[model samples]
Target: SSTRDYEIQRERIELGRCIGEGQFGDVHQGIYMSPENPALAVAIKTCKNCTSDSVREKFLQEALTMRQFDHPHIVKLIGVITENPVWIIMELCTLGELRSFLQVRKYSLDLASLILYAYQLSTALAYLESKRFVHRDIAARNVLVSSNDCVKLGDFGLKLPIKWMAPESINFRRFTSASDVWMFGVCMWEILMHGVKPFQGVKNNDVIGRIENGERLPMPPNCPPTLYSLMTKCWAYDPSRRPRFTELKAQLSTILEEEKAQ
Candidate 1:
């Protein structure tokens, strides 16, 4: 609303059909015709309760936060539409959500392909760490993939999915880079299992107890022991014991290279 450069004129955006829905509102396919470039395909997230100041502030916060990031693996926020039913425009990934993508592929991906996804995601998280931002939620459902195999982290904000959350986040409502590392481990599990929900048979109410008792999701089918070991280390009870994003990125990269050499 402050006439920022990232604010696009509503008249220039053509809203299309809804593509997805979330707790806050619906996300629709749209196009933005910028003066400097041709029409760009974009996804517009609309706030359902824009009349409420609190909701508006939250929506604006997400826009401002997204604007700060400029990494290849992080979703790009093109601009914002300030009028009623605020619209946050972002680059649309043709392949849709990563979870669904993995589900459809269903372990059909080779080891190299799987590791490539992990490598890219770890690289993205490492960039966020450099900026001192915590991605609180890092599940597959919050990730997007492009048809060209590009993966972008998205849906970042205050919300936390209980099963994907770290113990400290569940008990103390505390969030930090360490908590994000824990969630990233769970995200890897999701990918390795081809999008099976973590803690498959565990009841939602009992998940916290299981995690507090030092439980973790079983090793995903065909998961390498090396990667599984990293997942457990990430879920360590002491936050300080978890691997940093930089460390995770380096290790994953090295593993891929080693596999290539073998």
Candidate 2:
């Protein structure tokens, strides 16, 4: 017994359909019938090879990392089962990935709503910054749509996309809160573009070179100049020059406010 803080009995969680695939295994939608509270809808991360110690350890790492923080805009970690077939339990975001959700509702959703999504994420990232947690990965795909207006940060992506990474990260393998700001700016760009990915045709190897030469992601069509400027600050070549999540949160709020007035 390694003193698992958030351990739940195997019988507590009833696995449902496979909602999505992770690098290690399939993630399932489940129902957690808690002895202490009401039945809760949950997402379950299941390990494909729990028999292998290294695989099992790597699988639980995300869950362990999640246990430290609890914020409205960040998905909640419920519990874990380290027995036979390991499971990591989490709160379910019913509407699924924010990227697809935004893409589907592109025509129907207002710019204010889109801006609000960025503002919410900034709040979550700001909270994480206060706790000194560096989200190694950040993007629209890592965000989940809880409702039409509610998007949350979750789904730790193990595979890094170089395009969303900062110069320091791509070249030096350095991951810090500033690097996360760089990724968050890209995430904001994705939201404004209705889930379009940055550097559509650029090769990964060329991405770093282009970034070094002062190339930045283009402004989303119809994006406000003020908002676009804020995003560019996140892409500053020097990580120290990037706006803090706290600062971004405030700026995004102002952007959303003006957007609503229009």
Candidate 3:
């Protein structure tokens, strides 16, 4: 029987080598020894230039947002050291980012695993939807590999790729769960294609016109037709026409089951 406080002492965390860098600051792989669990591995998103009260508030806000979300396929918040440099500690996806991991293990991986990854993300997204959380970033890059059989959403980045934007998000700046579904579709396609870039070589400025003209990313070679059909539905011009995350979770499970039976 233990309770968790948002506060984490600076001395308790052992910072390791830098894992990745973001606009905010250096992200490090670290170790945390909690009262309940000893030697917990974590990723430290160190606060950057919280030179002002405003930036400090923004940094803590990230932790506050994650504090409310809990899902198996979502990266968990461990604790935070809200100090001089400040720290946003969260679960470490030891396998690193999804797209890179898939690309590295391409030849040895199975189609079933690829589809399974998509299915896992669907559950996570559906949970976010149920909680009224809008995750505007849902690319494979934003996803992390917890293990070969499991993936989780956490890694957030990019200067907002124009390619992942929905029709409405592009024109009107409207970001909702529906626009998020659009991004997830592209992310699923990226995974199925073994981490290939969506709209490979297409200009960002031209993506809207192409989608407006009813053009969608071509199904990757060897992608199950059933799965590709779901991707197509995500690109529906009308956000209302796109399947909800709950519907996606159901459809993805059906696809995974069929793949497993094969």
Candidate 4:
């Protein structure tokens, strides 16, 4: 089974203090030691309802999906423990969640850092698109940044934030690569606005109606015209008209270069 290859020795994983809380369980800073290597820092997530067959199945579903990926901008899975208290292990990101990091250093952020983060995120999405995968939830809250300013896409197979979701997803429960592109635009808006909530001031209950009526999030404060234009295209009413992740990635790369030349 796919799960067998990812199982780590129970004795090798040493759980440390809690660092986050997820819907299933708490996320902890931990240590993992393989027989041949030194101790490694890891983020450990406990799985809820491990005893429930259905829950365990769903948990493994996401774990397996993550295990198949290998990208610099995507969080790498360390291993999984299928015991009573199931654990999902992943590489520890030094700077932690992207939203909190951006909020804490909001005013200090520079244009280069913003463009770099955006480019890395688009690169990850492009890879996922190549793999025919859809990240149903694409938002700042679901991203992680490293101490060296590297961004890694994380969080999958979970409930999505409605504000960052696409019109098709909210209205029809439809998820696809195109819907993910829509969320990516919202993520960029959040980053540019220093983690401000998307569609702020709009009632959550009325967001769907607004989107249906051709309303969209206003251009983020001080966002470059080029970037804002790309965002508008991503939020196009018809998914078919939205640019692909590969195209977005290319545009972001160009933006980064343009910023460097300034």
Candidate 5:
């Protein structure tokens, strides 16, 4: 195995437990004492089967993505370094995936809370799209929420594929900016319905057929009508008819402001 480049502060750092695992690697909770700050918790993504070129590409992409914006709603990408295996150092989002959070805790979020999340996510998406990047996978698995209900988008691994995605990605496994918006609608349904899986009885092939024929996920229970309309527009079969992220962000923000005033 190749040795790590940076010397980890062993005395002050303790690896507690594994938080999550994915196809590429596992995420572990790291407790470290900072010289300038207090003890901070971080999650390190330990990648597996990674070649030198793949590692370099991931490093460059993550760094570039981080540098593209400095918004609080997006996950904080601290840095990347090789320590035996390569690692992506990111802020510890203790609350975990949005779906899991809603499942384990049986509490309903108020309209305000919903507005906050929608606004933040749309804002981040708008920023990414402005730079010609698309979040190919926008499902609940990629949405993280803090204890305070702060929502942030995650997982850029599928981003590059989105550029070439056709309008029928849910069935064809293609990706596109419009298809990402379609996933966004699914995500909204997940958030509103306490994280139900998409297409319960529908077969995978059926899902594709319906999506290609301009079918979409059902609206969630108690979802605001205006927001639901916006969501449906996002899932439109014609990419040209889909609302762009910038428009989505603006509409969500305006809705939040209006809801706040009421």
Candidate 6:
């Protein structure tokens, strides 16, 4: 069987137009042909440089990450077919990331819709925490939403700017479940505040000075006091003081419950 030539490696068949592009490569909806099984449509991610270890590691890690979980909101990682140019075949979530979607709609979301979207993301992060995995990049850009407004956390490159990083991770690149909480708080802030600019009129390096001098970005104008309290708790100077994902979820749930009851 090893000596036999592979028949399906004949030509590049174009299936559909490219849907998206990340930093590494373009994502195209392509079909694969097999002798025994029906053709399948896959989001093919072709690695830019197969020989580079960094490229190979990211390709492998993303595939491994997706294969680890199968939840309704998690994107499905199908399989890999390695030849000269390595490729990752995955399910296509056509809509795109949350930030882009919000921009398309001009950052104005109804309160009810915001709550639902927040709940979905909370549930996904809760699941990740349960599995002892933290999505270090929990920002507006990383949360992928489908055509129906359903969200799934994606992108596991693990590269984060220290400016947006939690205190614990700022000292060391180490990530914890609590760090994820901090990033989520930033994300929630982005959602509620329509991705407002952070630390406007101040140098990012001044963040350290401001922290030492006790200057902080004030709560967004008219943000719910209770949620503001919660976000502050998440950004506590000491990582130990921050609440767990479960606790945050419960608090949000309670807030939503009260809204529904009213």
Best by lDDT: 2
Model 5: per-residue lDDT, tens digit, 1-262?
A: 2223433445555666888864456777887666755778877666666666776565445445554566677877655554445666667777788777767654656677776787788887777777787543333137677556687876621122332223566445656667667666667666766767777776544555666676666677777778778777877777778888888888888877877887
Which residue runs of candidate 2 sit more than 4 Å off their true CA positions? Answer: 1-5, 35-38, 137-141, 156-158
lDDT of 2 at 129: 92
Q: How accurate is candidate 1 locally (lDDT)?
A: 0.82
Tens-digit per-residue lDDT, 1-262, candidate 2: 2427689988878899999866668889999997666788889888789899988887778777788789999988898998879898888899988888988898999999999999999999899899887764343238898888898988732146888898998899988998889988999999999999889998889999999899899888999999999999999999999999999999999989998888
Q: Give the lDDT of residue 59 in candidate 1.
A: 77
* Winner on lDDT (1 vs 3): 3
TM-score of each: 0.91, 0.93, 0.94, 0.92, 0.80, 0.78
Which lDDT tens digits does candidate 6 get at residues 1-262? 1212322352443356676765566666787666554576657776677688777776666666667787766766666655546666666666666766655664355555555666677887788789998653343236676655576666521134445667667666668988878777777776666555456677655665665565545676556677667777888877789898888888888766665665
Cα misplacement distance, residue 123 of candidate 1 (Å): 1.1
Poorly placed runs, candidate 5 (over 4 Å): 1-12, 50-69, 135-141, 156-166, 170-174, 212-214
- Model 3: lDDT to the true structure: 0.85
Candidate 5 CA-lDDT value: 0.65
Instruction: Please write out the lDDT profile of model 4 over residues 34-93, one tens digit for every residue.
Output: 866678888988776878988887776667878889999998998898777888888889
Q: What ranges in model 6 sit over 4 Å off? A: 1-16, 31-42, 106-108, 135-141, 156-159, 200-202, 215-217
Please identify model 4 stretches exceeding 4 Å from their true place.
136-141, 156-160
Predicted structure 1, TM vs. truth = 0.91
Candidate 6 clashes: the total is 0
Question: What is residue 198's positional error in candidate 3, in angstroms?
Answer: 1.1
Residue 93 miss distance in model 2 (angstroms) = 0.4
Model 6 residue 1 lDDT score: 13
| Residue 29, model 2: Cα distance from true site in angstroms | 1.0
